[PDB]
Ligand binder design. Structure first.
Ligand code: NAP
Ligand code: SUZ
Length: 315
């Protein structure tokens, strides 16, 4: 069952390709291979610094008539330095330009935290803390809504929002378009039951990022755990004649989540897609859920004093 119906009426493929850390000289081939082997959803962001190269791939596959534009589901994200209402459209248009698209299927507020505008993605002061902007979630949301009305994006959503921040938007005076998606970190070590149930209860689809535990994240430490090497998960994969990665990808799918594993390795791109031919039992699902440790690999530790930092709240 390969697409989920969003609250904007569009169908989103439940498996997509992640692109954070995909080197610019490797990501065009990664996305080409992905489309060839059946991916129809690509997760992008301006801050990843590789959208031009992602776009080359998409355009070549459209030109080759491997796929039609309406069959693709392209996602990107508004970076923190563009939260001011007057900057949102230009940020979207830069992403559209780089991706070689005339619309996005989904555009997310990447984080609830606005930063001072400028050339620096992470403008810093002396204490190691980010320089905020005096922007707020609701005004940025209104600017996102304008993108729908101007035809630049088919759906808007959020990422890394806690349930109180989602509630803020849902309670917005004059709300025109509800968020379609909340994209959050989710894997067996950070199972997210409370936030997922909240979002799903509101008709908001959850996308699970870092489903393999982001082993390539640049701040990984040698003592940190590794989902791909967890012998309990290895054992579940063996029972099914699948890889650990395949179990880690199938897991969120069975929770009615979208999942976006990243790879630049052609064999793994193909492996990661081969997750529609097996099912985890309910007992296996509950067992995987039992591995939760509240272990977050993307904690945005330079922004813990920002007024809108999302991870002080329980969920
Ligand atoms: N919204 C947000 O704030 C946010 C935050 C984080 C991530 N995301 C999105 O979510 C995507 C996925 O998360 P992520 O990039 O953090 O990490 P991930 O998908 O959990 O893990 C990617 C790592 O796993 C490796 N890998 C992939 N498939 C494998 C397989 N079958 N066997 C063994 N190793 C495998 C990759 O290696 P190779 O590439 O070398 O094959 C890479 O090192 C991102 O790329 C981005 O699109 C969003
Ligand atoms: C969590 C995270 C992500 C993941 C993502 O969105 O997919 C990311 C992606 C990028 F392209 C660049 C930075 C980040 C980041 C956190 C982070 C990194 C360095 C700093 S420096 C200011 O010390 C601060 C925060």
């Amino acid at each position: 069952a390969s697409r989920i119906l969003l609250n904007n009426g569009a169908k989103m493929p439940i498996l997509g390709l992640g692109t954070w850390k995909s080197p610019p000289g490797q990501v065009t081939e990664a996305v080409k291979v992905a489309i060839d082997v059946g991916y129809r959803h690509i997760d992008c962001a301006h801050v990843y610094q590789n959208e031009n190269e992602v776009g080359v791939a998409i355009q070549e596959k459209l030109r080759e008539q491997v796929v039609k534009r309406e069959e693709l589901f392209i996602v990107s994200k508004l970076w923190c330095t563009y939260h001011e209402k007057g900057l949102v459209k230009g940020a979207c248009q830069k992403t559209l330009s780089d991706l070689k698209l005339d619309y996005l299927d989904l555009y997310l507020i990447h984080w609830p935290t606005g930063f001072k505008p400028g050339k620096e993605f992470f403008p810093l002061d002396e204490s190691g803390n980010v320089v905020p902007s005096d922007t707020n979630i609701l005004d940025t949301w209104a600017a996102m809504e304008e993108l729908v009305d101007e035809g630049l994006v088919k759906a808007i959503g959020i990422s890394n929002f806690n349930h109180l921040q989602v509630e803020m938007i849902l309670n917005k005076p004059g709300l025109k378009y509800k968020p379609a998606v909340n994209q959050i970190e989710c894997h067996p070590y950070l199972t997210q039951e409370k936030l997922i149930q909240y979002c799903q209860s509101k008709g908001i689809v959850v996308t699970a990022y870092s489903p393999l535990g982001s082993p390539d994240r640049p701040w990984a430490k040698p003592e940190d755990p590794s989902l791909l090497e967890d012998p309990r998960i290895k054992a579940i994969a063996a029972k099914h004649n699948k890889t650990t990665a395949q179990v880690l990808i199938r897991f969120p799918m069975q929770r009615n989540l979208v999942v976006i594993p990243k790879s630049v390795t052609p064999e793994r791109i193909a492996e990661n897609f081969k997750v529609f031919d097996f099912e985890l039992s309910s007992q296996d699902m509950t067992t995987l859920l039992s591995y939760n440790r509240n272990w977050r690999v993307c904690a945005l530790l330079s922004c813990t004093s920002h007024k809108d930092y999302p991870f002080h709240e329980e969920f």
